[PDB]
Design a protein around this nucleic acid. Structure first.
Lengths: 258, 62, 142, 187
RNA sequence: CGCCCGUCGCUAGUACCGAUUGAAUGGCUUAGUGAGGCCUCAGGAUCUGCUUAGAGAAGGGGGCAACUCCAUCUCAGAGCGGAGAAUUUGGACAAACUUGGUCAUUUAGAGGAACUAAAAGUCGUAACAAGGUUUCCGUAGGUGAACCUGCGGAAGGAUCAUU
RNA sequence: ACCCACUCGGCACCUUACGAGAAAUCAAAGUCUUUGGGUUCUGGGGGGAGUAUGGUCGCAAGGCUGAAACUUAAAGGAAUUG
RNA sequence: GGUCGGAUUUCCAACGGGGCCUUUCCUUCUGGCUAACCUUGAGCUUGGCGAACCAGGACUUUUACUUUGAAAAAAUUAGAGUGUUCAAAGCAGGCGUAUUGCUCGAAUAUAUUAGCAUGGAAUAAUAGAAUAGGACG
RNA sequence: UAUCUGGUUGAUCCUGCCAGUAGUCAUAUGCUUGUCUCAAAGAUUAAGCCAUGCAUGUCUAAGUAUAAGCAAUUUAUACAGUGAAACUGCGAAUGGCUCAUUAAAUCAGUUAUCGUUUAUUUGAUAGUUCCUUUACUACAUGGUAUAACUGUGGUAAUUCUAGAGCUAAUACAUGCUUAAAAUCUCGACCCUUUGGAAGAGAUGUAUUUAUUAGAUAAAAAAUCAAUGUCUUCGGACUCUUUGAUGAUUCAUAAUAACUUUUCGAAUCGCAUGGCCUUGUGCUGGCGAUGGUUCAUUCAAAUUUCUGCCCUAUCAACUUUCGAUGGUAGGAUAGUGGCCUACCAUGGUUUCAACGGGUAACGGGGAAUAAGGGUUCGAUUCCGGAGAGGGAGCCUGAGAAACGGCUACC
């Protein structure tokens, strides 16, 4: 329509934000950023509909403007900034550090963690290229573009970063038999321990993946997210660890935790 | 623009209206349980029919 | 096909500077490229004196995207042909199909010699013309 | 404005498409440049995204490369003598791409002398050693020798001046040289 | 004393043909005129930078007397340029109008010929029984009307039957 | 040329009614609600109407294709007794 | 029943699945894994034939079909839980020592054809080497 | 919850229709109507006309403020507080309304851009700007208005505007200031001739062209055009290095030039910190603004396969003057008949082309049902189109803008 969009209704906003179909017929549009539109969590929906630390966007703007908040080691004083996958946020108040990861129910969880677990993150390499003047570089899944990494670091690998700079703490390559995390599809939030893969040269590299209950499935190689090696995750993981039990098994779980 | 509030009834009229047997039976029920409305009676029968359809198409399964 | 430079212009491969000063073996040079996806750049294209820049192998026209197979029915055009995609559209109500065809046109190189009935597969390339999007890569008859 | 789409054209069967949209700015075109010689005039036009576009006109001088030597010198332009697209562009002397023109040939001549010390047409110790080493390459060929005798040398324009403001090209050699002089001589 | 056909006559309706070179509406459109902007050939009011440019003669510095050095209000005059609207050639884009053609959608109409309907209209009585000339089909002709007659065909016939 | 027996293909026939059908009736008009061997053509209440128009064929007579408006609750099939 | 109506063994048997041979090559050359290593060191040693990992060279005659998966925007629909005082609804709510507070949720299903991969090879056609320009050579 | 009934007859079986019956987020109307909760609502006929009034303006600590505006600096002589109007920068291309258009067109799923623009955000990113490069030039920093305002004012009217005098900039036009090496040329000079040479110009970014590299199935032999490495000048000769891609003339690097010349901070708020060579010397922080390239993100435009209602009382359609293709060129931001020049004459068709009609925008979906299905779907969400009909275009990253301009009707 004659130019960029600026508005966003509810019911075009994604499902997993869990925004309610009442309460005004307009929704918070994620302004552009280092993450996409849909696999992103605005800070407004975060603060206003995950913690209830505020009730209204006016209050949230007060918060963002008084700068209790900071992402990537930076204040990021916008009410609708994309808090994407894996991302880190640090709050002086309560001295908390929340991390933005997924749950198996297909939602952005709220992973309470410490300042060092915030001070490092994870990032999937999106691609690698050679910039001008012969500077090899790569770019991640969070718009971060980084220069002079190891040549051993290639595509589909994952990096662990300092968060005071965009430099590397370490890296993990992609190969058969490594612990991963899923981003896309019915498997949103699974953790399923790569068992093998398949090429289909021409499009849609596919991967057969199963979690420790033997339970297997198949996913797209650009929807997966490698988090390190089998056993140790490089971070702390949320309730469930990407399992997707049955409706009845979860019913029994909660009925035990009545 | 405001997404419209869903509405859906909780009753269903008789297929065939004037059956003296049906009318006298439901009148007995109304006059014993203290009711005013065949609307209420149809409503309860409709709930029962829904759950009964579920029962049928569930016990159909292994 | 008597003369490669039949036209007023000088048809060649761009940037392939055959230096007239040095007199080396294979008096004229020729670029090429393996299309990928398990295709073959034929020896007629390698040895060819022709140009046909719209060819995927010697030319500069990347094949990428959809791929199709069909039988050739026309040849009356210049490095361009038309095929027939015989297929069957299903009707659920009557629960059964009906013949349909869509005669997509494609581009063809001198690398292939094609008579009618020669079944052929192609590759999605950029818009070659108003009518054309595809280019032939393998033939299946004689 | 000049459209660039096919919603104004016919379908492939012979069917008038219906009138669907109004003309746009992202399907437009613009008038040709019709670049000429003398008194360099370059009007510029604003494009989609800023992204300037130097509409060449009246361009008197341009750059020309000699690839056997790897050199690239600035030169005037005598005039165009052949164009496959149109003898009209030939007559009216309008520069475009693929365009066969004549250039002064004097910078190439004097550079040849300065580089090899070998005559065309018709001293110090270091430069003498240089030329003695650079010898075995003052043997270009007969046709270029004749053209350097004449002082008007055949080049092909390979730029798009109406898009760039630049008449750039290269001297003809050997094969296409023979082909195009044959086309000229066809009588 | 059943049922039933058609003409003719009255009342009402629906559609059809129809002179009217019929009328409108909309779309496509040849040809012609062709605005308006845009691009390109020029244009040049206007403003404006530089370069000098000599002098009407002030000021001071120096032969201190004519005379000499530079600045100076001044004004041409000259080029060296920058931008430059009005106007302007040619081009492609092309609204609108005129005129025809054409495609569809509605529509008026003297009159004419039909159809339908309508409790009790007239003329007969063709049909249903062998319906009082067995009926019907096609074709041709005839006449107020149903209808009759000729040629061939059928049984839905009034015969399944002549060793 | 006859007789007997058999055979393949034909015009049909006598009886049954397993089967079918609304019934008359039918060796298919059967093997279809226990619904499917293959294909073509046609009908969707009665009339208007095989009318009107437009094409198309014919010298013409007329033929092929072929609606609508409007009107109506019945027309119609097969058998029973009177 | 070795648990007091849960779960195990040899299980006789069935049920469908994988592999070898029965004239049944069911692509092989390069490789490294040499693999399964004939490799054996005294009862756990030093050395077998490439796909079982993989890069390629390679023949890969064609389909329809059928299976599985990724994906198919929400709302809607069906449907989990949920006392809007019931209900239509909505997605909230519930529990505290009620001062620090604690805490499950917002599932799941459906998603036609067509498109991608996909195990199969019955069914239907589908060319194949016959005055052999025939394969192994 | 896979259901039937009445009606042709004197009656019977049938066909066959009619009517009845149930429902509709399907409308209208009638008669009536006490309450709680939720809520549609000028689409259908006229995308018919429209009075009136609103619907997009906008600032911080932080671009420009002497408001002859207002508080008071008194920590500030230039202000340094606040602050209309105005310049400037953004945005006004989203939203919202309607469904007229449109029947392979939109649209829906599904591909590509190895064929392109992309403000904005976000991550990275400009030692190379003195061009007779020595006086050609301030870099503790350069030039120009002009608004607002002062006032003269002119029309009946206009968000009508001229005339004269000021002044500002992140507005305009300009503008130097930081390394080291390294190849080419020259080339002084020695002259050597095996040939050795001081000293000088260049090189950042960006555009345009030409050229090279950008890879790599396997092992030895004969030499030299001249041995080339260092020499046993008997020849040992190895050493070699290149990423991604399904696949590229890819990324990227270098030679040679092109440029009317692109970027390389003359901007701003706070805080004032350290060395002494005791100079307003030298250095220093947290920010905002903008800025070349690349990538990213919100987009955008094109694009592959499949799929659309009724019509043959529409069977041939398209190509004059583009229809199908090809070559060259132009334009485009980009491919490409998008357009032109030239050339071949082709292309679609009963597997229903083309033409007509549509109370047709499409889809996600709605009613309704055992299944199958039929019908509707302008209409809250998605994609399209439009602003009274048409055409055009400026500004801009982004419009063919209409609550923006120009014309015609």
């Amino acid at each position: 329509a004659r130019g960029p969009k600026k508005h966003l209704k509810r019911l075009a906003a994604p499902h997993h934000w869990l925004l309610d179909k009442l309460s005004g017929c307009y929704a918070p549009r994620p302004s552009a950023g280092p993450h996409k539109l849909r696999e992103s969590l605005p800070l407004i929906v975060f603060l206003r509909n995950r913690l209830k630390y505020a009730l209204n966007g006016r209050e949230v703007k007060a918060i963002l403007m008084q700068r209790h908040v900071k992402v990537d080691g930076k204040v990021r004083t916008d009410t609708t900034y994309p808090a994407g996958f894996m991302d880190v946020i640090t709050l002086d108040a309560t001295n908390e550090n929340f991390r933005l990861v997924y749950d198996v129910k297909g939602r952005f969880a709220v992973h309470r963690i410490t300042d060092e677990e915030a001070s490092y993150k994870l990032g999937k390499v999106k691609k690698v290229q050679l910039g001008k003047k012969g500077v090899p570089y790569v770019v991640t899944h969070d718009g971060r573009t980084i220069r002079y990494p190891d040549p051993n670091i290639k595509v589909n690998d994952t990096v662990k970063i300092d968060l005071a700079s965009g430099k590397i703490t370490d890296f993990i390559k992609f190969d058969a038999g490594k612990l991963v995390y899923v981003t896309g599809g019915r498997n949103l939030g699974r953790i399923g321990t790569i068992v093998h893969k398949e090429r289909h040269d021409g499009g849609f590299d596919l991967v057969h993946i199963k979690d420790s209950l033997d339970n297997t499935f198949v996913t797209r190689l650009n929807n997966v997210f490698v988090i390190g090696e089998q056993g140790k995750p490089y971070i702390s993981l949320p309730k469930g660890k990407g399992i997707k039990l049955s409706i009845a098994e979860e019913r029994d779980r909660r009925r035990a935790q009545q | 623009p405001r997404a419209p509030r869903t509405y859906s009834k909780t009753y269903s009229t008789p297929k065939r209206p004037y059956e003296s047997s049906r009318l006298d039976a439901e009148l007995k029920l109304a006059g014993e349980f203290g009711l005013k409305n065949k609307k209420e009676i149809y409503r309860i029968s409709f709930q029962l029919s829904k759950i009964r359809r579920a029962a049928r198409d569930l016990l159909t399964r292994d | 096909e008597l003369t490669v430079q039949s036209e007023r212009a000088f048809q060649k491969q761009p940037h392939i500077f055959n230096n007239p000063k040095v007199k080396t073996s294979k008096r004229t040079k020729r670029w090429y490229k393996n299309a990928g996806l398990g295709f073959k750049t034929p020896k007629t294209a390698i040895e060819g004196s022709y140009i046909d820049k719209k060819c995927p192998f010697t030319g500069l026209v990347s094949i990428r995207g959809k791929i199709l197979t069909g039988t050739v029915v026309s040849t009356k055009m210049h490095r361009t042909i038309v095929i027939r995609r015989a297929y069957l559209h299903y009707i659920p109500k009557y629960n059964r199909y009906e013949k349909r065809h869509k005669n997509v046109p494609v581009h063809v190189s001198p690398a292939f010699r094609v008579q009618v009935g020669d079944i052929v597969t192609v590759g999605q390339c950029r818009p070659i013309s108003k009518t054309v999007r595809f280019n032939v890569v393998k033939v299946s008859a004689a | 404005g000049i459209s660039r789409d096919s919603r104004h054209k016919r379908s492939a069967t012979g069917a008038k498409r219906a009138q669907f949209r109004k003309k746009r700015k992202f399907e437009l075109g613009r008038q040709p440049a019709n670049t000429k010689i003398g008194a360099k005039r370059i009007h510029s036009v604003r494009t989609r995204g800023g992204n300037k576009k130097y509409r060449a006109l009246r361009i008197e001088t341009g750059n020309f490369s000699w690839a056997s030597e790897g050199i690239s010198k600035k030169t005037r332009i005598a005039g165009v003598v052949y164009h496959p697209s149109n003898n009209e562009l030939v007559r009216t002397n309008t520069l475009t791409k693929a365009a066969i023109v004549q250039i002064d040939a004097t910078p190439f001549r004097q550079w040849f002398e300065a580089h090899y010390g070998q005559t065309l047409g018709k001293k110090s110790k270091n430069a003498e050693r240089k030329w003695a080493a650079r010898a075995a390459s003052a043997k270009i060929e007969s046709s270029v020798e004749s053209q350097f005798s004449a002082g008007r040398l055949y080049a092909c324009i390979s730029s798009r001046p109406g898009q760039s403001g630049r008449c750039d090209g290269y001297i003809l050699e050997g094969e296409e040289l023979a082909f195009y002089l044959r086309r000229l001589t066809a009588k």
